Every structure is written in C-alpha cells, then in structure tokens.
Amino acid sequence: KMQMLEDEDAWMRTLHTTASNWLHLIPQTLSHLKRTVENIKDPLFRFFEREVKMGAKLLQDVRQDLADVVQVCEGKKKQTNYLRTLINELVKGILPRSWSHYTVPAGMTVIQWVSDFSERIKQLQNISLAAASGGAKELKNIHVCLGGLFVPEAYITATRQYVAQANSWSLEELCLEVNVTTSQGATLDACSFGVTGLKLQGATCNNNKLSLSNAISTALPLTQLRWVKQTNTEKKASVVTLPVYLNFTRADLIFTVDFEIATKEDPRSFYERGVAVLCTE
C-alpha cells in the first residue's frame, strides 16, 4: 500500500480485469426460500429464511455495484464523485463504508472479503437448494459451517428452539454439551446438530479430551452441538470453559464450550495458554 500517494513516476483497465474476475467468481443469483404456513412454525426455517433473504439482498446489491463498475470500465457508463472515491478506495485496498453489512474481521483486504463472500454465498446457495428440495426437516440434517453464517449466534439459538419444540421443553431446562467427533457423518441425535468450520487454538482434541500442543492451531473435525436437559450435576474439576470467537482479533463472542482435561495438567495451564476456539483464522 506504499506506492499510491505520489509514486506516479492505468488503473481503469486493471480494475476492469479484476471486476471481470469478481463477476466470474461471485455466483449470479441467490433464490429466496419459499415460505409455507407449515414450514414457518419451524425456527430453523425462520432463521434460514432470514439469512437467505439478507444474503440474497446483499448479493443483488453487490452484483449491481459490480455491474456499474464494469459498465463504467467498459466505457458505457460514468461514475460520479463519490463513486470515484469508491474507485480510489478499491485501488488503495480499503473496504469502503458501503460494504460492511455483516460481521467481518476489521481492516482486511477487499479481495479476501470478496473471496469469503463468495464462499458464504455458495454455502447459502447449498442450504437454500437443500431447503427447496427437502423442506424444514432437512435443515436439521444438513451440516452448516458456523463461521460462514451471517449470524451463527442466531443459528445456535435456532437449534435450541428446534429441540425445544421437538421435545416440548421450556428454554430454561436446556444446556449445551460439546461433542467434537473425529468420525465424519455420525448419526445425529434429535438434539444434536452438525457444525463444521471450527479450529482450536493452543490445544488439540483427542476423544473429546484436550491436550496442550505447541502448534499454532489444530483443524477441528465435524463438531456436534447437543442440547441435553440441564440436570443438577456437580461440575467436575477437569472441565474447562473456552470461548468461541468468530475471528482472530477476538473482539466479539459467539458462545462457550466445555471440554475435558485429559492428563495431569491444570486448567489454569489452558487458561494461561489462551486456548480459544476460532471460526475463522
């Protein structure tokens, strides 16, 4: 980012090429979820409909702005002063104020922003086509990446509501137990949901029991979040509470997990290790 103040000793054509690449990589359309009165009783369907709506509206806005960029770069349209400032920001590598429509790491590159936008839009397309093919029932069965959702806090709330409706239980008698299974495609319980996209920090998982590691991070396999009835069970001394931050800067929290100390080590060692759970690196 050094060379864009006075090192002028041709950005339109390069911006045209990268905008053509952006149009190539971003998917064209995001179809909205069809709403029925039977499906609207499912909070999973409610949350997924809201996310599909927000993602498709943002998709339409970004496709329209990209179309404006490519039409101006093709010599068919003209961009005004504020859009010239937008061009300056896109050249200099700063995400403008008209794109922070969800939760994202602060001060990151626009190309990676568009790349993870493409990934999450592909995830939304997958879940939308699964919903269209099967209904609200398959919304529980389909594994959903936690970090790729716009609001995974509302996702875990939605799974809470789904098990509450399924077992006709109040939302003060439910608690979350974390089951990181190395097995892929495990038989999901009616209270258990499949979540990928997690990665552990400062620790490694071994049969739902942590151990200290000198590595930077570990690749967490298919996680299962299970809502079991909160009994009055005494908490063990070998149980450790870890945050699940969304990103690396770790400014906002998603939810808390409970894992098990395996060997002699103090959970104070985990705490001073700063063992966290990240959704994005």
Question: Which residues contact another protein (rule: CB under 8 A)?
Answer: 1-9, 12, 18, 21, 25, 40-41, 43, 46-47, 92-93, 109, 111, 153-154, 157, 161, 164-165, 168-172
Q: Name, in order, each residue with C-beta under 8 angstroms of 210's C-beta and a sequence gap of 6 or more.
A: 200, 203, 204, 240, 259, 260, 261, 262, 270, 275
Residue placing its CB nearer to another protein in the complex, 91 or 215: 91
Shorter beta-carbon distance to another protein: residue 82 or 215: 82
Instruction: Give SS3 for 120.
Output: helix
Q: Are 196 and 231 in contact (CB under 8 A)?
A: no
Question: Looking at residue 102, what DSSP letter applies?
Answer: S
> Least distance in Å: CB of 154 to another protein?
6
CB 224 within 8 A of CB 188: yes
**Cβ atoms within 10 Å of 43's Cβ, excluding its own:** 19
Nearer to another protein, 25 or 186 (CB): 25
250 vs 266 by CB, closer to another protein:
250
Q: How far is the CB of 274 from another protein (least distance, A)?
A: 19
Of 14 and 263, CB closest to another protein: 14
d(CA 208, CA 213): 15
Name the minimum Å distance from CB 229 to another protein.
Answer: 13
CB of 279 to another protein, least distance (A): 19
Q: Least distance from C-beta 214 to another protein, angstroms?
A: 26
Which residue reads 């998603």 in tokens? 254
